[PDB]
Design a protein around this ligand. Structure first.
Ligand SMILES: Nc1ncnc2c1ncn2[C@@H]1O[C@H](COP(=O)(O)OP(=O)(O)OP(=O)(O)O)[C@@H](O)[C@H]1O
Ligand SMILES: Nc1ncnc2c1ncn2[C@@H]1O[C@H](COP(=O)(O)OP(=O)(O)OP(=O)(O)O)[C@@H](O)[C@H]1O
Ligand SMILES: [Mg+2]
Ligand SMILES: [Mg+2]
Lengths: 166, 161, 161, 166
């Protein structure tokens, strides 16, 4: 399966006016001035798929991912991200052409997940992602600065990485 | 353990060499083990003409390209439905960026690729371009065509005032 | 000590604000002290529209631009006969690279500047371009004109095979 | 004063066949493929002006700056760099339109300096450079990776830097 689009609402630099981000089934390039919100789109994906740590998403607290009041706009009541997955070849264990996963986080740090509408648990979502070969252990997400890290690594840490791959 | 660890290592290593050879024409790179697993994993790369040296002795740019070869090799071992790359071409030159971009365009026929780059050579190889911009602290998105994206870039390069 | 330390700090800080304001149109940046010298030196930057945040909270690219403003400010305090810059535009976008390049082109009338960059926007602003290349492990140098350098770059961007 | 050109002989990736690198009095851009020898030119300048540490020049030992035998070429017997300075406005304390500083290092790590031909001591060279406002404390040389460092710095280390500037 592949990502059709990505809806953001009050997530990091994306205001209260819901934003829709469409992707090509093939190769998509995200460009923009420095500090415009390119990496935040990456953050939205990490987040909606079971965003473990606020640190990898450069946030002190998980609650800092909520849109911060700006010039002509109040702060969000919460942060929401809904990624639409294309389920034609049936990579997931569901009987549905379209799979939608939605996550919402509140000022208190509470997070609610949704699967095609129904409420769900991170664990169920993680399991549906895993069945589609979408996992943190797949290393399919390379963050700003990760290459510079794969470099610093010592032959040791490097040998240990293939340990986990095994 | 060391029975399967070698099954994977041989699989990944096999990938690292073929990818690298593509990114570095006329060159090569092997993932030789220090203890054929008490020590570590070393990387030896050898481009066209130059001598063999451990990754840590290469130039910044060569290190970044070699590291990518490694990463790409780990992804080939366990294929994902999509990939998100944020600035993986920050140290590569126009020629090297193009090689990485052609490789990504190629694999693009089987898995989905979402690359965030500031380089023009990288975006120009994409099926779609998403331009991000900000106004009064608010991020906005707009689907930019290949021509419109280039016009903006050519304008930055013109001598204004 | 704190009598002169403030004489310099006020001099450098004054520079940081004016340079930054040039690199970030409509923006600003101050070097406020944590203890007006028991603590440290903090950096607060505020671009056009966005709120004020310490350098450590900015985006990678904004951090690199702000850091450069700082560096440039220290060089203005004690002007050198020449400067050598190696990859100072590795994280800046085409628009930002151009701003740094125009600033360097400007100061270029008083001090000498030797910048090593992989970006085309940076080299295109130079009075002279030195192309380095290697063959069989040996580095070679050749004086490349503005047109010849661009031809090579346009060729990398064409769709070959 | 300003740099007219830079002659390298057996220095790092530059072979035994002496190489001449001319510079504009204004703005010069050095370009080239990754790993071609761009930064080594920077290294040649650090070196010829009193190259303190082999580390900042990415060399285990000071002797590793000597050209390493290649395909169709033997290793250098030594590494030499001669930078030609334009002395018109008289930035230096010498009465000469052209100031030339030459440094040579041998496999044993011995280094010989030359000033406009005459032999000289690092200290005399350092002093002539200092009089021309050319010093390590001028921060006029920003190496590959330095910006990434000015970033990592903590507000402390940053306050300490202006200490040295004072
Ligand atoms: N919770 C939030 N509310 C409002 N703005 C936020 C929030 N979290 C982050 N931001 C803004 O996001 C911006 C950084 O975004 P991002 O990392 O996406 O930029 P970028 O385009 O990747 O930059 P670069 O090209 O320099 O990497 C900063 O200007 C920051 O103020
Ligand atoms: N003593 C030496 N003898 C021969 N070659 C050497 C020596 N020291 C360094 N080199 C070669 O110099 C090259 C790196 O040079 P340099 O750092 O100048 O490249 P670069 O053009 O700056 O690369 P990048 O754009 O990736 O930063 C390596 O290929 C290395 O093998
Ligand atoms: Mg970013
Ligand atoms: Mg370099």
């Amino acid at each position: 399966p592949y990502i059709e689009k990505l809806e953001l609402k009050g997530f990091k630099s994306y205001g209260n006016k819901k934003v829709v981000i469409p992707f090509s089934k093939g190769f998509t390039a995200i460009v923009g001035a420095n500090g415009s919100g390119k990496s935040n789109i990456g953050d939205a994906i990490l987040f909606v798929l079971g965003g473990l740590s606020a640190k990898a998403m450069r946030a002190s607290r998980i609650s800092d991912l909520i849109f911060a009041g700006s010039k002509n706009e109040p702060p969000a009541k919460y942060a929401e991200v809904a990624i639409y997955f294309n389920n034609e070849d049936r990579g997931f264990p569901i009987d549905e052409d379209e799979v939608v996963i939605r996550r919402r986080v509140y000022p208190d740090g509470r997070s609610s997940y949704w699967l095609n509408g129904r409420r769900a648990t991170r664990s169920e979502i993680l399991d549906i992602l895993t069945a589609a070969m979408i996992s943190p252990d797949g290393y399919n997400i390379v963050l700003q600065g990760d290459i510079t890290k794969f470099i610093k690594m010592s032959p040791l840490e490097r040998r240990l990485l293939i340990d986990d791959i095994s | 353990k060391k029975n399967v660890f070698m099954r994977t290592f041989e699989a990944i290593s096999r990938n690292f060499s073929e990818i690298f050879a593509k990114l570095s024409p006329g060159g090569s790179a092997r993932l030789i083990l220090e203890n054929p697993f008490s020590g570590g994993l070393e990387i030896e790369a050898k481009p066209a003409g130059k001598d063999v040296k451990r990754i840590e002795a290469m130039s910044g740019g060569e290190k970044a390209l070699t590291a990518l070869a490694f990463v790409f090799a780990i992804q080939k071992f366990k294929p994902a439905p999509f990939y998100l790359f944020d600035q993986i071409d920050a140290h590569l030159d126009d020629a090297n960026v193009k090689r990485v971009a052609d490789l990504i365009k190629e694999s693009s026929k089987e898995s989905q690729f979402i690359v965030i780059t500031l380089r023009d050579v990288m975006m120009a190889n994409a099926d779609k371009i998403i331009g991000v911009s900000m106004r009064d602290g608010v991020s906005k998105v707009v689907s930019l065509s290949l021509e419109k994206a280039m016009k903006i870039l050519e304008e930055i390069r013109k001598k204004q005032g």
